[PDB]
Write a protein that binds this ligand. Structure first.
Ligand SMILES: [Cl-]
Ligand SMILES: [Cl-]
Ligand SMILES: [Cl-]
Ligand SMILES: [Cl-]
Ligand SMILES: [Cl-]
Ligand SMILES: [Cl-]
Lengths: 184, 184, 183, 183
């Protein structure tokens, strides 16, 4: 018997990174309205997901609009959600002789001090890819894997010849945006 | 003592789908050249990967150039590789009451005959996303998940109320471009 | 007086990027006082919907355009699939020079030369200078990647077909507008 | 007479999309007869390299630009990182109407109106008509998604600030060129 007069969404704006999420609050007026149910909706669902409780999750770079609409009265308020780039910062996961630099959503694989170096890698349940790593020109090597998303699972190991003869590396698993690096 | 005179790559062009691969042949002249080693390289490695044996794998929509260069003489030939879109065709994986349509690289989740329907899903090792599915307006529901790639692993189940009361579905696993559907 | 329900017409439709489909909302009784609806879209990157329910395809994917009633806020949906540009081949030039349009990439080409460069600009971006890749039979190619509908490519070649080097005249390609022959 | 080796200068460099960095190849002995190199790139979608080693950033990612010697075909590499456009906010308009540039999306806005539509065209694409989304305090927003450097946006609004409806004049935004104030 106490009708909804209005709604507002707080925060009214928010920046998340990909895989990051932010809880939104629908504020229904008056305080003692009989029906305080709202429907959450988003106009760019490839940018950000919203749950039935207004938890918003960053899916991909962009700005979108999340709307709370009241069950009683169909009053609507909206917030602007900016999903930001993965920082351009370099994070080393590996050692002097071989591993990864995570550089945003590309992975730069490296082998220092070899006569050659191949990378063997797979992403999620896609197949093995074998690549010869590019020579820097000083006995060092690199190969970029491009455009991973949050939760991409990377299994890789190297083949290379540091002197004595060609050596295989132990496989490693990298999950994009969960494997901790060293922020160098 | 028999020097390389030239090289050609066959096929000279090729279309693959994403996750599809094509073996390329470097033809070194003359036939009895002492050194027949070549280096394979690709100018758009976000489009297609090439192995040290000239196996080319479709990574993402585009056209790129794969080059064989001879170890002896640095003679170069190149092929054009077109990585094609995942067909726009609709493939149903699920039943009368609930599952997926695979429509290119988007997944259309569905629940037929409910008073409401939520989807619970996760991709690779990213987190759970909870979404209320959109009403069609006849007791039916849909929710598109966007832009999966080859080997994306999707675990999902539904919550919905077909009458008696709200019911949870058994979890299912979908691997993008490996789970077989029904081409409808 | 009240409205009771609504569904949308069509319920599912497939478009190419850059193409449109007119949506129409049918609201239960004709003797419903208020007919007017609001159009919205779940996935605005994929498809845009006008205030009168015209859906245009912007990018590959499937999205949900919903009509909600002014009187009632009853809601119904169409599933819109935006299909990618065919990887058919479209030749725009002559035996010596031009593009192949292969979906959203352009394969620029020069046939019969000792080198070939490309000079191109996309819309109001900067000019880029590139050496075209040798094929190994006196011909050259260079892919420009991932053009979107309405992209405007200005370009000319520098090549030497033997009796000395040449700059061709600038041509204008508009992506999804300019046409050629496929074969 | 021969060349013995080469490395590239710089070895690693980071650019924004649309920005450039001059690469230089240093080939072992100065008393190497032939100095000339060929520039190539592993990832042409990410970065373009000119015949004289100028690398321009086209799109987010890391790629390898290699200099190989004409005499010797010795090869060396730089790792190029192309950084995304900051998600800083850039206001281009007044208290009533304009855009926020937020990385590669534009948030169009009208403040203080009873409705607001956007009319926009991108480069030589078609005009799109959209109803701007109510905020719930008499203001309106509408994101345009994923513009690339050099994209040319023509737009005007239809809104009613109370004493009746208005079409504003068309403005031209060029992505990464047009500027405003961030704050
Ligand atoms: Cl979207
Ligand atoms: Cl949006
Ligand atoms: Cl690439
Ligand atoms: Cl390429
Ligand atoms: Cl959607
Ligand atoms: Cl690369």
């Amino acid at each position: 018997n106490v009708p909804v007069t209005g709604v507002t969404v707080n925060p009214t704006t928010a920046q998340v990174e990909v895989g990051q999420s932010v809880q939104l609050n629908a504020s229904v007026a008056p305080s003692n309205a009989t029906n305080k149910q709202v429907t959450w909706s988003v106009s760019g669902s490839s940018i950000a997901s919203v749950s039935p409780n207004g938890l918003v999750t960053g899916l991909a770079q962009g700005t979108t609009t999340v709307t709370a609409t009241t069950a009683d009265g169909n009053k609507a308020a909206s917030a602007t959600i900016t999903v930001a780039p993965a920082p351009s910062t370099v994070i080393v996961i590996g050692d002097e002789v071989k591993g990864l630099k995570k550089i945003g959503d590309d992975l730069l694989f490296y082998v220092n001090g070899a006569t050659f170096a191949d990378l063997h890698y797979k992403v999620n349940n896609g197949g093995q890819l074998n690549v010869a790593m590019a020579p820097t020109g000083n006995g060092n090597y690199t190969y970029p894997v491009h455009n991973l998303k949050h939760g991409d699972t990377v299994e890789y190991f190297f083949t290379y010849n540091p002197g004595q003869g060609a050596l295989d590396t132990p496989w490693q698993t990298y999950v994009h945006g969960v494997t901790q690096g060293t922020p160098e």
